[PDB]
Design a binder for this molecule. Sequence first.
Ligand SMILES: [Ca+2]
Ligand SMILES: [Ca+2]
Ligand SMILES: [Ca+2]
Ligand SMILES: [Ca+2]
Lengths: 68, 234
Amino acid sequence: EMSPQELQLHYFKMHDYDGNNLLDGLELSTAITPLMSEDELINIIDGVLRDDDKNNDGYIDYAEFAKS
Amino acid sequence: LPHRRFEYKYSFKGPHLVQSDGTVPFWAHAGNAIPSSDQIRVAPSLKSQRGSVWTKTKAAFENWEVEVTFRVTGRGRIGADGLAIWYAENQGLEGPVFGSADLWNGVGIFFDSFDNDGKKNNPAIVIIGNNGQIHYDHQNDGASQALASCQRDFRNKPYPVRAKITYYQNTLTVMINNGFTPDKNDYEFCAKVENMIIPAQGHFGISAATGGLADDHDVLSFLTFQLTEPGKEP
Ligand SMILES: [Ca+2]
Ligand SMILES: [Ca+2]
Ligand SMILES: [Ca+2]
Ligand SMILES: [Ca+2]
């Protein structure tokens, strides 16, 4: 099995479908998804960007994802 | 150097483009628009087809950039009718303008593959501003109305064609990646409109249609970015 660090990178790249080592809101959508209302989907993704995305570029990189 | 912020709420892409229930999240499709998981076939190679995909809410960005990736494919050396990329005040869900409403308030960038006025100047890309009052002149391929234009054969290309449309400091710029290489950053200048006014708030959109002739109109992705001037904050 994986170390805690190897597990973090693993779940970071799990929805990095374009392989650019950055998580965008659409890639998050796919992670988050009968179906929830589109308003609750926006609220969640928005919350994640507001919490994780420090340089406000609409992406979450590994550093932002991990914290430490 | 302008700050670039990705906006997921006004975007869509592969490889999970559609949701389990057939919707593109945050986008409305209409007419005969078909979303699947890797592309949206906006207008199929069937007769007199009309399709559009527009955003569900208005973007309020003073500066923006959209990158649209697409294929226009047809069995012949002449196809029809073409594809339109929009920023407008209202959703133009259905209508006669490359698949959507006429008399739009804003800008439509038309990728015109059909030479309706026989001027031998197609496929072409034309930028057409509108204020809610002008009818699109499709019999002259908008030549009486065009703010700027270029000649690009955007049909049947080895790789997806890309359009980069930038609205920055009042200037609307179109760059085209003509689909000859797998390098997605090989853009060439198409057209420029200085001092352009478009509404403060609008829907982004994409639409297609076919005539007697009929090309397949596939959009692989629509990527929207907010632009901030050096000195401000997003
Ligand atoms: Ca990514
Ligand atoms: Ca970031
Ligand atoms: Ca023409
Ligand atoms: Ca035409």
